[model samples]
Target: NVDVKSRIMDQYADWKGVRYRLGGSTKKGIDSSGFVQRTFREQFGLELPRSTYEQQEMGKSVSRSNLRTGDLVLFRAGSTGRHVGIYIGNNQFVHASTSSGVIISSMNEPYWKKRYNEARRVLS
Candidate 1:
């Protein structure tokens, strides 16, 4: 049976293999912030800012140990860049990876784990 949570995963399938394009939000190519913005609206009926910085400002700070469905995880780019993703459970999240495009990544991965900034809950 299809539900909100499943619907969100369905979105992941719909966007599978999409290439990453900075400053873009279309199916052809998309970036982290845009991907998160659209996913929240589609899956949770919530609207988030178009940019990561602003999106980060919209929700309450959440700990890594407490992330829930549709939660937003903010990532810091090697002491520089800022990225965002939507938590999809099992320590996994979906986002538009700059190097590979839309994909699922494990938060526990060393790369992500080291860069993890914070998680936020915006769909309350």
Candidate 2:
């Protein structure tokens, strides 16, 4: 599992600067869910849904305190929208931000902490 965590982190290093774009799933641009979908597919050879909500429904729920690396971290957006990222431990996760594109962020950050919803484990 530690090797899996490092592999995911190394993948983040390769995708650190791609800009965020709605509905995009390529290096030219990518959205939050698109980033999640592609990361899972490419890094772990696992196919994940292409939208945040559907991705949210892919795995069993995990308590926030019990999250492991590669878990899907969900966030609430406004009223009905959702955001997602891959957990990377130490309370940090990698996500594609509307403003910052693909980057690693911390759940403890005020903005993320307020919006944190739940986490899901798709890797068993």
Candidate 3:
């Protein structure tokens, strides 16, 4: 499957290689929720909580079928626990992946697809 969502890729330039760190909030290191908070505030003028549980609580729920650019995708991973990503359309999302660092991944990936929990929208 092929997808091209340029703004997400462009904003996250070279960030694809950043190392993952718990509670990280900068260029040196960052986690999924941290990444989402930073990116949304910086790129979209949206403010979100630093943690997933709270962030997930703040936004209004949006169904997968209606997800648009800028929606938040939340997931549950086995060992990794919870995860968050910014939906950039075309079934792709930008997130701080523990295994791969900051990167663009697919919602269609079996791992993500199966664990997909919800989608939220903070933009109005």
Candidate 4:
């Protein structure tokens, strides 16, 4: 509900600006999946797998239009590169971007819109 959204946004406020680092899970640096894992564990007491491949399979599939706050939104890059983000509603998501570190981005952006893969609901 709105409370969950508030907590998620609060978490974002705490982690914002942390740089992205491959295989990193600390505030010093972190990857997309790493951020997702830590956020869920700290905010919801849910222990999610560390890798994107495994995390994507943790929850049941949810349609794009049905995405809610805390839903995991995945994306494809090339063929093997996959990225993940926490959907925060209003067509936006929070993710650790390689180029920009931790930030909130709009799904309407051409880059994300074109790379959109699927969303998963882990909080249900």
Candidate 5:
């Protein structure tokens, strides 16, 4: 199984401040899938599938009640498997917002939960 740590947390500290790029994959510019792919590479030694739609098939499903800080949160903002976010607990998650750039929002928020598609565990 993959080891979890606060070190991984530090890597994402500035993530919410990251700006969105059409297809960005770095600190300078990042999109939804880019954020997940980069984080996994940096902390988990895994090169994620090309896009969120593809990445979903790589993880195992987890119940919402069992979700942890680093779990992948899937969503269908527009098309199937189109968007993804990282769950950070306290009912909050961080994602690359198209208009507002990267931002942290509560899961209880109507808009996000309303768009909630699925949850998956990538560890191990």
Candidate 6:
């Protein structure tokens, strides 16, 4: 349902300058959860639940085969649910890195594919 690429880019605008802080939501700093909240609010006018665990309960599930750009792709890296990213076009997407700020990444990569939990499409 979501227009994944353009919307994620829009969220990127809202998330700009929002520093990386674990579990932080404020623009001054943001953790992965904060980033998702900020992203949804800014791009989709949606007030989502706090944290990834909460978010997982909102949108309906879609297979990786159905995933489109701007989709919310979740992943559990190690023990914790670690990452979220916007599905950009061409099997790629962009996300804010704690160590690298905002950058493009690929789902085709083994690391991402292995860690990817599921994709959720939440938009009109």
What TM-score does structure 1 among the candidates reach?
A: 0.91
Q: Comparing 2 and 4 by TM-score, which wins?
A: 4
**What order do you get sorting by lDDT, best first?**
4, 2, 1, 3, 5, 6
| lDDT digits (tens) for residues 4-119 of candidate 4 | 78888888999999998988999999999999999998888899999999999997999998999999999985224899999999999999988888999999999999999999
Residue lDDT tens for model 1, 34-85:
8888887876677788888898898699998899877889898512289998
Residue 27's lDDT in candidate 3: 80
Off by over 4 Å in 3: 1-7, 78-80
Residue range with the least summed lDDT across 10 consecutive positions in model 4: 74-83
Go through the candidates in order and give the clash count of each: 0, 0, 0, 0, 0, 3
Give me the displacement of residue 11 in model 5, in angstroms.
2.2
Itemize residue pairs with steric clashes in candidate 1: none
Tens digits of per-residue lDDT for model 2, 1-124: 3377887877778889899888888888988899888887877889998888799899799999899989999998523368898998998999888778899999999999999999899996
Per-residue lDDT, model 6, residue 49, is 79
Q: lDDT winner among the candidates?
A: 4
TM per candidate:
0.91, 0.93, 0.88, 0.94, 0.84, 0.79
Q: Residues 24-55, candidate 5: write the lDDT tens digits.
A: 78889888888888877887788888687787
Better of 2 and 5 by lDDT: 2
Candidate 5: count of backbone clashes, pairs at least 3 residues apart or interchain: 0
Give the C-alpha lDDT of model 5: 0.77
- Please report, in order, the local distance difference test score of every candidate based on alpha carbons: 0.84, 0.86, 0.82, 0.90, 0.77, 0.70
Q: Please give the range of 10 consecutive residues that has the lowest summed lDDT in model 2.
A: 76-85
CA RMSD per model (angstroms): 2.2, 1.8, 4.1, 1.8, 2.4, 2.8
